Amino acid sequence: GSHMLEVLTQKHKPAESQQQAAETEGSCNKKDQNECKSPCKWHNDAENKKCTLDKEEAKKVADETAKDGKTGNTNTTGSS
């Protein structure tokens, strides 16, 4: 609740709403179908539909090379 940034997710995404944040297994389970965040994992025909956090997905959501910090051309070996 104090991100240094400010922008939620302004990009060429075909959807805008709550800023994509790496949730947790505890939150995902509670999250509804629409609330089922990216880090989570939607389960179809789960007897009554179920959402749960996924480590693999969470890794990708965090390693988006943008959330943690800006990154692109040049970073290692290049500056030499």
Side-chain angles (χ1 to χ4, degrees), residues 23-58:
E23 308 295 63
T24 61
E25 187 182 0
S27 60
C28 295
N29 302 181
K30 312 302 297 300
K31 296 294 145 101
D32 298 359
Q33 181 178 61
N34 174 62
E35 298 180 59
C36 197
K37 297 293 182 301
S38 181
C40 305
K41 188 69 66 64
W42 188 235
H43 298 302
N44 182 295
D45 290 358
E47 301 180 60
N48 288 286
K49 302 297 178 59
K50 304 184 64 61
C51 181
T52 61
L53 192 280
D54 186 61
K55 301 181 180 60
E56 300 180 60
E57 300 296 357

PDB file of all heavy atoms in Angstrom, residues 23-58:
ATOM      1  N   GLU A  23      -1.023 -11.582  -6.195  1.00  0.00           N
ATOM      2  CA  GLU A  23      -1.828 -11.934  -5.034  1.00  0.00           C
ATOM      3  C   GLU A  23      -1.211 -13.110  -4.276  1.00  0.00           C
ATOM      4  O   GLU A  23       0.004 -13.305  -4.301  1.00  0.00           O
ATOM      5  CB  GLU A  23      -3.255 -12.271  -5.481  1.00  0.00           C
ATOM      6  CG  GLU A  23      -3.889 -11.199  -6.355  1.00  0.00           C
ATOM      7  CD  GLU A  23      -4.095  -9.886  -5.622  1.00  0.00           C
ATOM      8  OE1 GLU A  23      -3.092  -9.274  -5.198  1.00  0.00           O
ATOM      9  OE2 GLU A  23      -5.264  -9.467  -5.473  1.00  0.00           O
ATOM     10  N   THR A  24      -2.056 -13.887  -3.602  1.00  0.00           N
ATOM     11  CA  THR A  24      -1.604 -15.040  -2.833  1.00  0.00           C
ATOM     12  C   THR A  24      -2.679 -16.114  -2.801  1.00  0.00           C
ATOM     13  O   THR A  24      -3.854 -15.830  -3.019  1.00  0.00           O
ATOM     14  CB  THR A  24      -1.238 -14.651  -1.386  1.00  0.00           C
ATOM     15  OG1 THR A  24      -2.385 -14.116  -0.717  1.00  0.00           O
ATOM     16  CG2 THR A  24      -0.111 -13.628  -1.367  1.00  0.00           C
ATOM     17  N   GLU A  25      -2.266 -17.352  -2.547  1.00  0.00           N
ATOM     18  CA  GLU A  25      -3.194 -18.475  -2.509  1.00  0.00           C
ATOM     19  C   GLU A  25      -4.412 -18.154  -1.654  1.00  0.00           C
ATOM     20  O   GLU A  25      -5.538 -18.508  -2.000  1.00  0.00           O
ATOM     21  CB  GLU A  25      -2.497 -19.723  -1.972  1.00  0.00           C
ATOM     22  CG  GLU A  25      -3.346 -20.979  -2.069  1.00  0.00           C
ATOM     23  CD  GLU A  25      -2.656 -22.200  -1.490  1.00  0.00           C
ATOM     24  OE1 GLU A  25      -1.508 -22.067  -1.015  1.00  0.00           O
ATOM     25  OE2 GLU A  25      -3.266 -23.291  -1.511  1.00  0.00           O
ATOM     26  N   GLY A  26      -4.175 -17.486  -0.535  1.00  0.00           N
ATOM     27  CA  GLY A  26      -5.258 -17.130   0.360  1.00  0.00           C
ATOM     28  C   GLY A  26      -6.256 -16.172  -0.259  1.00  0.00           C
ATOM     29  O   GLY A  26      -7.461 -16.301  -0.043  1.00  0.00           O
ATOM     30  N   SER A  27      -5.761 -15.202  -1.018  1.00  0.00           N
ATOM     31  CA  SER A  27      -6.634 -14.215  -1.650  1.00  0.00           C
ATOM     32  C   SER A  27      -7.369 -14.800  -2.855  1.00  0.00           C
ATOM     33  O   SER A  27      -8.568 -14.582  -3.024  1.00  0.00           O
ATOM     34  CB  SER A  27      -5.828 -12.988  -2.077  1.00  0.00           C
ATOM     35  OG  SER A  27      -4.816 -13.336  -3.003  1.00  0.00           O
ATOM     36  N   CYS A  28      -6.639 -15.531  -3.689  1.00  0.00           N
ATOM     37  CA  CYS A  28      -7.212 -16.137  -4.889  1.00  0.00           C
ATOM     38  C   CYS A  28      -8.436 -16.988  -4.571  1.00  0.00           C
ATOM     39  O   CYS A  28      -9.471 -16.866  -5.229  1.00  0.00           O
ATOM     40  CB  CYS A  28      -6.161 -16.992  -5.595  1.00  0.00           C
ATOM     41  SG  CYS A  28      -4.751 -16.041  -6.246  1.00  0.00           S
ATOM     42  N   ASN A  29      -8.315 -17.847  -3.566  1.00  0.00           N
ATOM     43  CA  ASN A  29      -9.415 -18.720  -3.172  1.00  0.00           C
ATOM     44  C   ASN A  29     -10.678 -17.909  -2.918  1.00  0.00           C
ATOM     45  O   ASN A  29     -11.786 -18.341  -3.236  1.00  0.00           O
ATOM     46  CB  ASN A  29      -9.051 -19.505  -1.908  1.00  0.00           C
ATOM     47  CG  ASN A  29      -7.791 -20.340  -2.066  1.00  0.00           C
ATOM     48  OD1 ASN A  29      -7.377 -21.033  -1.136  1.00  0.00           O
ATOM     49  ND2 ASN A  29      -7.169 -20.280  -3.240  1.00  0.00           N
ATOM     50  N   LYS A  30     -10.497 -16.735  -2.331  1.00  0.00           N
ATOM     51  CA  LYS A  30     -11.609 -15.854  -2.014  1.00  0.00           C
ATOM     52  C   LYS A  30     -12.098 -15.102  -3.251  1.00  0.00           C
ATOM     53  O   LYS A  30     -13.283 -14.790  -3.367  1.00  0.00           O
ATOM     54  CB  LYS A  30     -11.188 -14.860  -0.932  1.00  0.00           C
ATOM     55  CG  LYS A  30     -10.485 -15.515   0.251  1.00  0.00           C
ATOM     56  CD  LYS A  30     -11.357 -16.569   0.918  1.00  0.00           C
ATOM     57  CE  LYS A  30     -12.615 -15.961   1.517  1.00  0.00           C
ATOM     58  NZ  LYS A  30     -12.298 -14.936   2.550  1.00  0.00           N
ATOM     59  N   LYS A  31     -11.176 -14.791  -4.162  1.00  0.00           N
ATOM     60  CA  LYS A  31     -11.515 -14.057  -5.365  1.00  0.00           C
ATOM     61  C   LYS A  31     -12.515 -14.795  -6.232  1.00  0.00           C
ATOM     62  O   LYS A  31     -12.387 -15.993  -6.486  1.00  0.00           O
ATOM     63  CB  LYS A  31     -10.254 -13.745  -6.159  1.00  0.00           C
ATOM     64  CG  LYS A  31      -9.345 -12.837  -5.397  1.00  0.00           C
ATOM     65  CD  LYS A  31      -9.991 -11.501  -5.224  1.00  0.00           C
ATOM     66  CE  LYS A  31      -9.607 -10.917  -3.898  1.00  0.00           C
ATOM     67  NZ  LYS A  31      -8.536  -9.890  -4.017  1.00  0.00           N
ATOM     68  N   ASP A  32     -13.500 -14.048  -6.689  1.00  0.00           N
ATOM     69  CA  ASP A  32     -14.545 -14.585  -7.554  1.00  0.00           C
ATOM     70  C   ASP A  32     -13.999 -14.808  -8.958  1.00  0.00           C
ATOM     71  O   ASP A  32     -12.837 -14.513  -9.223  1.00  0.00           O
ATOM     72  CB  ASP A  32     -15.746 -13.637  -7.602  1.00  0.00           C
ATOM     73  CG  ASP A  32     -16.386 -13.443  -6.241  1.00  0.00           C
ATOM     74  OD1 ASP A  32     -15.903 -14.053  -5.263  1.00  0.00           O
ATOM     75  OD2 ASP A  32     -17.374 -12.683  -6.152  1.00  0.00           O
ATOM     76  N   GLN A  33     -14.836 -15.327  -9.853  1.00  0.00           N
ATOM     77  CA  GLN A  33     -14.417 -15.586 -11.229  1.00  0.00           C
ATOM     78  C   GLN A  33     -13.707 -14.373 -11.821  1.00  0.00           C
ATOM     79  O   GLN A  33     -12.569 -14.471 -12.279  1.00  0.00           O
ATOM     80  CB  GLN A  33     -15.627 -15.953 -12.090  1.00  0.00           C
ATOM     81  CG  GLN A  33     -15.272 -16.266 -13.534  1.00  0.00           C
ATOM     82  CD  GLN A  33     -16.480 -16.670 -14.357  1.00  0.00           C
ATOM     83  OE1 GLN A  33     -17.424 -15.896 -14.514  1.00  0.00           O
ATOM     84  NE2 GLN A  33     -16.456 -17.889 -14.884  1.00  0.00           N
ATOM     85  N   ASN A  34     -14.380 -13.229 -11.795  1.00  0.00           N
ATOM     86  CA  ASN A  34     -13.812 -11.997 -12.315  1.00  0.00           C
ATOM     87  C   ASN A  34     -12.639 -11.535 -11.455  1.00  0.00           C
ATOM     88  O   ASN A  34     -11.688 -10.933 -11.952  1.00  0.00           O
ATOM     89  CB  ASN A  34     -14.884 -10.908 -12.370  1.00  0.00           C
ATOM     90  CG  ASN A  34     -14.322  -9.566 -12.776  1.00  0.00           C
ATOM     91  OD1 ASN A  34     -13.790  -9.405 -13.874  1.00  0.00           O
ATOM     92  ND2 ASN A  34     -14.436  -8.592 -11.885  1.00  0.00           N
ATOM     93  N   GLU A  35     -12.719 -11.825 -10.160  1.00  0.00           N
ATOM     94  CA  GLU A  35     -11.674 -11.442  -9.218  1.00  0.00           C
ATOM     95  C   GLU A  35     -10.457 -12.347  -9.343  1.00  0.00           C
ATOM     96  O   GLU A  35      -9.374 -12.004  -8.873  1.00  0.00           O
ATOM     97  CB  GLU A  35     -12.209 -11.472  -7.787  1.00  0.00           C
ATOM     98  CG  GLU A  35     -13.343 -10.491  -7.541  1.00  0.00           C
ATOM     99  CD  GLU A  35     -13.850 -10.536  -6.113  1.00  0.00           C
ATOM    100  OE1 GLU A  35     -13.048 -10.289  -5.189  1.00  0.00           O
ATOM    101  OE2 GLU A  35     -15.051 -10.820  -5.919  1.00  0.00           O
ATOM    102  N   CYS A  36     -10.634 -13.503  -9.980  1.00  0.00           N
ATOM    103  CA  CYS A  36      -9.531 -14.434 -10.159  1.00  0.00           C
ATOM    104  C   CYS A  36      -8.410 -13.727 -10.910  1.00  0.00           C
ATOM    105  O   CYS A  36      -8.448 -13.594 -12.134  1.00  0.00           O
ATOM    106  CB  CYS A  36     -10.000 -15.683 -10.912  1.00  0.00           C
ATOM    107  SG  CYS A  36      -8.870 -17.107 -10.780  1.00  0.00           S
ATOM    108  N   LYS A  37      -7.436 -13.233 -10.154  1.00  0.00           N
ATOM    109  CA  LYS A  37      -6.318 -12.482 -10.717  1.00  0.00           C
ATOM    110  C   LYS A  37      -5.376 -13.363 -11.536  1.00  0.00           C
ATOM    111  O   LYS A  37      -5.409 -14.588 -11.441  1.00  0.00           O
ATOM    112  CB  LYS A  37      -5.558 -11.778  -9.599  1.00  0.00           C
ATOM    113  CG  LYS A  37      -6.398 -10.738  -8.867  1.00  0.00           C
ATOM    114  CD  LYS A  37      -6.731  -9.556  -9.763  1.00  0.00           C
ATOM    115  CE  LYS A  37      -7.533  -8.502  -9.019  1.00  0.00           C
ATOM    116  NZ  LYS A  37      -8.812  -9.048  -8.485  1.00  0.00           N
ATOM    117  N   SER A  38      -4.549 -12.713 -12.356  1.00  0.00           N
ATOM    118  CA  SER A  38      -3.602 -13.415 -13.221  1.00  0.00           C
ATOM    119  C   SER A  38      -2.729 -14.392 -12.429  1.00  0.00           C
ATOM    120  O   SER A  38      -2.669 -15.574 -12.770  1.00  0.00           O
ATOM    121  CB  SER A  38      -2.723 -12.419 -13.980  1.00  0.00           C
ATOM    122  OG  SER A  38      -1.809 -13.087 -14.832  1.00  0.00           O
ATOM    123  N   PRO A  39      -2.043 -13.931 -11.358  1.00  0.00           N
ATOM    124  CA  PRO A  39      -1.196 -14.799 -10.543  1.00  0.00           C
ATOM    125  C   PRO A  39      -1.941 -16.054 -10.117  1.00  0.00           C
ATOM    126  O   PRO A  39      -1.356 -17.129  -9.987  1.00  0.00           O
ATOM    127  CB  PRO A  39      -0.860 -13.934  -9.316  1.00  0.00           C
ATOM    128  CG  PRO A  39      -1.774 -12.761  -9.389  1.00  0.00           C
ATOM    129  CD  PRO A  39      -2.031 -12.556 -10.842  1.00  0.00           C
ATOM    130  N   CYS A  40      -3.243 -15.898  -9.900  1.00  0.00           N
ATOM    131  CA  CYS A  40      -4.095 -17.001  -9.486  1.00  0.00           C
ATOM    132  C   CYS A  40      -4.189 -18.068 -10.571  1.00  0.00           C
ATOM    133  O   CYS A  40      -3.307 -18.189 -11.422  1.00  0.00           O
ATOM    134  CB  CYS A  40      -5.490 -16.474  -9.151  1.00  0.00           C
ATOM    135  SG  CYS A  40      -5.507 -15.150  -7.900  1.00  0.00           S
ATOM    136  N   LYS A  41      -5.268 -18.837 -10.529  1.00  0.00           N
ATOM    137  CA  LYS A  41      -5.495 -19.898 -11.502  1.00  0.00           C
ATOM    138  C   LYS A  41      -6.962 -20.300 -11.501  1.00  0.00           C
ATOM    139  O   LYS A  41      -7.474 -20.826 -10.512  1.00  0.00           O
ATOM    140  CB  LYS A  41      -4.619 -21.110 -11.177  1.00  0.00           C
ATOM    141  CG  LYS A  41      -4.645 -22.193 -12.244  1.00  0.00           C
ATOM    142  CD  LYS A  41      -3.949 -21.738 -13.515  1.00  0.00           C
ATOM    143  CE  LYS A  41      -2.462 -21.541 -13.291  1.00  0.00           C
ATOM    144  NZ  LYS A  41      -1.779 -22.814 -12.933  1.00  0.00           N
ATOM    145  N   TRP A  42      -7.640 -20.036 -12.611  1.00  0.00           N
ATOM    146  CA  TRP A  42      -9.054 -20.355 -12.730  1.00  0.00           C
ATOM    147  C   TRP A  42      -9.269 -21.841 -12.994  1.00  0.00           C
ATOM    148  O   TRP A  42      -8.575 -22.444 -13.812  1.00  0.00           O
ATOM    149  CB  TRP A  42      -9.694 -19.531 -13.848  1.00  0.00           C
ATOM    150  CG  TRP A  42     -11.185 -19.665 -13.903  1.00  0.00           C
ATOM    151  CD1 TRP A  42     -11.935 -20.038 -14.981  1.00  0.00           C
ATOM    152  CD2 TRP A  42     -12.108 -19.419 -12.836  1.00  0.00           C
ATOM    153  NE1 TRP A  42     -13.268 -20.045 -14.648  1.00  0.00           N
ATOM    154  CE2 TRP A  42     -13.400 -19.667 -13.337  1.00  0.00           C
ATOM    155  CE3 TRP A  42     -11.969 -19.015 -11.503  1.00  0.00           C
ATOM    156  CZ2 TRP A  42     -14.543 -19.525 -12.554  1.00  0.00           C
ATOM    157  CZ3 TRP A  42     -13.104 -18.873 -10.729  1.00  0.00           C
ATOM    158  CH2 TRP A  42     -14.377 -19.127 -11.256  1.00  0.00           C
ATOM    159  N   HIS A  43     -10.245 -22.422 -12.302  1.00  0.00           N
ATOM    160  CA  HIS A  43     -10.564 -23.834 -12.471  1.00  0.00           C
ATOM    161  C   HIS A  43     -11.993 -24.005 -12.971  1.00  0.00           C
ATOM    162  O   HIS A  43     -12.954 -23.768 -12.235  1.00  0.00           O
ATOM    163  CB  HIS A  43     -10.374 -24.589 -11.154  1.00  0.00           C
ATOM    164  CG  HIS A  43      -8.965 -24.565 -10.649  1.00  0.00           C
ATOM    165  ND1 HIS A  43      -7.897 -25.038 -11.382  1.00  0.00           N
ATOM    166  CD2 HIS A  43      -8.448 -24.123  -9.479  1.00  0.00           C
ATOM    167  CE1 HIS A  43      -6.786 -24.889 -10.684  1.00  0.00           C
ATOM    168  NE2 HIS A  43      -7.093 -24.336  -9.525  1.00  0.00           N
ATOM    169  N   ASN A  44     -12.115 -24.415 -14.231  1.00  0.00           N
ATOM    170  CA  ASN A  44     -13.416 -24.623 -14.860  1.00  0.00           C
ATOM    171  C   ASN A  44     -14.009 -25.971 -14.456  1.00  0.00           C
ATOM    172  O   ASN A  44     -13.291 -26.964 -14.333  1.00  0.00           O
ATOM    173  CB  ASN A  44     -13.282 -24.533 -16.382  1.00  0.00           C
ATOM    174  CG  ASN A  44     -14.609 -24.691 -17.098  1.00  0.00           C
ATOM    175  OD1 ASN A  44     -15.234 -25.749 -17.045  1.00  0.00           O
ATOM    176  ND2 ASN A  44     -15.048 -23.633 -17.771  1.00  0.00           N
ATOM    177  N   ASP A  45     -15.323 -25.990 -14.245  1.00  0.00           N
ATOM    178  CA  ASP A  45     -16.026 -27.207 -13.846  1.00  0.00           C
ATOM    179  C   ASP A  45     -15.444 -27.783 -12.561  1.00  0.00           C
ATOM    180  O   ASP A  45     -15.382 -29.000 -12.385  1.00  0.00           O
ATOM    181  CB  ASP A  45     -15.976 -28.253 -14.963  1.00  0.00           C
ATOM    182  CG  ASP A  45     -16.828 -27.872 -16.159  1.00  0.00           C
ATOM    183  OD1 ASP A  45     -17.486 -26.811 -16.105  1.00  0.00           O
ATOM    184  OD2 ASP A  45     -16.840 -28.634 -17.148  1.00  0.00           O
ATOM    185  N   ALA A  46     -15.029 -26.898 -11.658  1.00  0.00           N
ATOM    186  CA  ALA A  46     -14.466 -27.315 -10.380  1.00  0.00           C
ATOM    187  C   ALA A  46     -15.576 -27.639  -9.387  1.00  0.00           C
ATOM    188  O   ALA A  46     -15.467 -27.337  -8.197  1.00  0.00           O
ATOM    189  CB  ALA A  46     -13.565 -26.227  -9.825  1.00  0.00           C
ATOM    190  N   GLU A  47     -16.650 -28.233  -9.905  1.00  0.00           N
ATOM    191  CA  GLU A  47     -17.822 -28.598  -9.111  1.00  0.00           C
ATOM    192  C   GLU A  47     -18.666 -27.362  -8.827  1.00  0.00           C
ATOM    193  O   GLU A  47     -19.891 -27.441  -8.738  1.00  0.00           O
ATOM    194  CB  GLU A  47     -17.417 -29.278  -7.799  1.00  0.00           C
ATOM    195  CG  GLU A  47     -16.599 -30.543  -7.999  1.00  0.00           C
ATOM    196  CD  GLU A  47     -16.210 -31.200  -6.688  1.00  0.00           C
ATOM    197  OE1 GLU A  47     -17.119 -31.579  -5.921  1.00  0.00           O
ATOM    198  OE2 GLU A  47     -14.996 -31.334  -6.429  1.00  0.00           O
ATOM    199  N   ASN A  48     -17.991 -26.225  -8.696  1.00  0.00           N
ATOM    200  CA  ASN A  48     -18.642 -24.952  -8.423  1.00  0.00           C
ATOM    201  C   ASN A  48     -17.692 -23.805  -8.746  1.00  0.00           C
ATOM    202  O   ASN A  48     -17.805 -22.714  -8.185  1.00  0.00           O
ATOM    203  CB  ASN A  48     -19.038 -24.889  -6.953  1.00  0.00           C
ATOM    204  CG  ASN A  48     -20.205 -25.794  -6.621  1.00  0.00           C
ATOM    205  OD1 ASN A  48     -21.352 -25.506  -6.965  1.00  0.00           O
ATOM    206  ND2 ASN A  48     -19.910 -26.911  -5.974  1.00  0.00           N
ATOM    207  N   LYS A  49     -16.750 -24.076  -9.648  1.00  0.00           N
ATOM    208  CA  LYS A  49     -15.753 -23.088 -10.059  1.00  0.00           C
ATOM    209  C   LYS A  49     -14.837 -22.734  -8.889  1.00  0.00           C
ATOM    210  O   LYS A  49     -15.309 -22.470  -7.782  1.00  0.00           O
ATOM    211  CB  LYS A  49     -16.433 -21.824 -10.596  1.00  0.00           C
ATOM    212  CG  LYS A  49     -17.361 -22.084 -11.774  1.00  0.00           C
ATOM    213  CD  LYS A  49     -16.606 -22.637 -12.973  1.00  0.00           C
ATOM    214  CE  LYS A  49     -17.546 -22.936 -14.131  1.00  0.00           C
ATOM    215  NZ  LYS A  49     -18.289 -21.724 -14.572  1.00  0.00           N
ATOM    216  N   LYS A  50     -13.527 -22.743  -9.126  1.00  0.00           N
ATOM    217  CA  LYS A  50     -12.570 -22.438  -8.064  1.00  0.00           C
ATOM    218  C   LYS A  50     -11.341 -21.696  -8.590  1.00  0.00           C
ATOM    219  O   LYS A  50     -10.818 -22.011  -9.657  1.00  0.00           O
ATOM    220  CB  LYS A  50     -12.125 -23.727  -7.369  1.00  0.00           C
ATOM    221  CG  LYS A  50     -13.276 -24.545  -6.802  1.00  0.00           C
ATOM    222  CD  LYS A  50     -12.778 -25.760  -6.034  1.00  0.00           C
ATOM    223  CE  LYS A  50     -11.979 -25.360  -4.804  1.00  0.00           C
ATOM    224  NZ  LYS A  50     -12.800 -24.575  -3.840  1.00  0.00           N
ATOM    225  N   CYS A  51     -10.877 -20.717  -7.812  1.00  0.00           N
ATOM    226  CA  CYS A  51      -9.696 -19.933  -8.169  1.00  0.00           C
ATOM    227  C   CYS A  51      -8.614 -20.112  -7.103  1.00  0.00           C
ATOM    228  O   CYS A  51      -8.896 -20.034  -5.909  1.00  0.00           O
ATOM    229  CB  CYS A  51     -10.057 -18.450  -8.308  1.00  0.00           C
ATOM    230  SG  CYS A  51      -8.656 -17.378  -8.773  1.00  0.00           S
ATOM    231  N   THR A  52      -7.380 -20.362  -7.538  1.00  0.00           N
ATOM    232  CA  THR A  52      -6.270 -20.565  -6.609  1.00  0.00           C
ATOM    233  C   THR A  52      -4.968 -19.990  -7.157  1.00  0.00           C
ATOM    234  O   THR A  52      -4.712 -20.043  -8.358  1.00  0.00           O
ATOM    235  CB  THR A  52      -6.060 -22.059  -6.297  1.00  0.00           C
ATOM    236  OG1 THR A  52      -5.748 -22.772  -7.501  1.00  0.00           O
ATOM    237  CG2 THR A  52      -7.301 -22.662  -5.657  1.00  0.00           C
ATOM    238  N   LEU A  53      -4.149 -19.440  -6.263  1.00  0.00           N
ATOM    239  CA  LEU A  53      -2.874 -18.851  -6.648  1.00  0.00           C
ATOM    240  C   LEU A  53      -1.921 -19.912  -7.174  1.00  0.00           C
ATOM    241  O   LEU A  53      -1.882 -21.035  -6.670  1.00  0.00           O
ATOM    242  CB  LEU A  53      -2.259 -18.111  -5.460  1.00  0.00           C
ATOM    243  CG  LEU A  53      -1.065 -17.202  -5.768  1.00  0.00           C
ATOM    244  CD1 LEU A  53       0.213 -18.006  -5.910  1.00  0.00           C
ATOM    245  CD2 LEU A  53      -1.324 -16.374  -7.017  1.00  0.00           C
ATOM    246  N   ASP A  54      -1.158 -19.543  -8.190  1.00  0.00           N
ATOM    247  CA  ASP A  54      -0.197 -20.455  -8.797  1.00  0.00           C
ATOM    248  C   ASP A  54       1.207 -19.876  -8.707  1.00  0.00           C
ATOM    249  O   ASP A  54       1.428 -18.711  -9.035  1.00  0.00           O
ATOM    250  CB  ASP A  54      -0.564 -20.718 -10.261  1.00  0.00           C
ATOM    251  CG  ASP A  54       0.323 -21.773 -10.894  1.00  0.00           C
ATOM    252  OD1 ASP A  54       0.319 -22.923 -10.404  1.00  0.00           O
ATOM    253  OD2 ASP A  54       1.021 -21.451 -11.877  1.00  0.00           O
ATOM    254  N   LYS A  55       2.155 -20.689  -8.253  1.00  0.00           N
ATOM    255  CA  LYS A  55       3.535 -20.244  -8.116  1.00  0.00           C
ATOM    256  C   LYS A  55       4.139 -19.898  -9.474  1.00  0.00           C
ATOM    257  O   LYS A  55       4.754 -18.848  -9.635  1.00  0.00           O
ATOM    258  CB  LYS A  55       4.380 -21.318  -7.432  1.00  0.00           C
ATOM    259  CG  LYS A  55       3.875 -21.701  -6.050  1.00  0.00           C
ATOM    260  CD  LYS A  55       4.767 -22.746  -5.401  1.00  0.00           C
ATOM    261  CE  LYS A  55       4.263 -23.127  -4.019  1.00  0.00           C
ATOM    262  NZ  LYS A  55       2.887 -23.695  -4.066  1.00  0.00           N
ATOM    263  N   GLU A  56       3.954 -20.788 -10.446  1.00  0.00           N
ATOM    264  CA  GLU A  56       4.484 -20.575 -11.790  1.00  0.00           C
ATOM    265  C   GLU A  56       3.990 -19.249 -12.364  1.00  0.00           C
ATOM    266  O   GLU A  56       4.778 -18.448 -12.869  1.00  0.00           O
ATOM    267  CB  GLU A  56       4.076 -21.726 -12.711  1.00  0.00           C
ATOM    268  CG  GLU A  56       4.584 -23.083 -12.252  1.00  0.00           C
ATOM    269  CD  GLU A  56       4.161 -24.208 -13.178  1.00  0.00           C
ATOM    270  OE1 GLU A  56       4.529 -24.163 -14.371  1.00  0.00           O
ATOM    271  OE2 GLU A  56       3.462 -25.131 -12.711  1.00  0.00           O
ATOM    272  N   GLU A  57       2.684 -19.024 -12.274  1.00  0.00           N
ATOM    273  CA  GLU A  57       2.086 -17.793 -12.773  1.00  0.00           C
ATOM    274  C   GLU A  57       2.623 -16.592 -12.008  1.00  0.00           C
ATOM    275  O   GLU A  57       2.980 -15.575 -12.600  1.00  0.00           O
ATOM    276  CB  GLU A  57       0.561 -17.852 -12.656  1.00  0.00           C
ATOM    277  CG  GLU A  57      -0.070 -18.990 -13.441  1.00  0.00           C
ATOM    278  CD  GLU A  57       0.128 -18.859 -14.941  1.00  0.00           C
ATOM    279  OE1 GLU A  57       0.719 -17.849 -15.379  1.00  0.00           O
ATOM    280  OE2 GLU A  57      -0.315 -19.763 -15.679  1.00  0.00           O
ATOM    281  N   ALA A  58       2.682 -16.724 -10.686  1.00  0.00           N
ATOM    282  CA  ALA A  58       3.185 -15.655  -9.830  1.00  0.00           C
ATOM    283  C   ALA A  58       4.603 -15.261 -10.224  1.00  0.00           C
ATOM    284  O   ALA A  58       4.965 -14.086 -10.195  1.00  0.00           O
ATOM    285  CB  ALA A  58       3.139 -16.088  -8.371  1.00  0.00           C
TER     286      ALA A  58
END
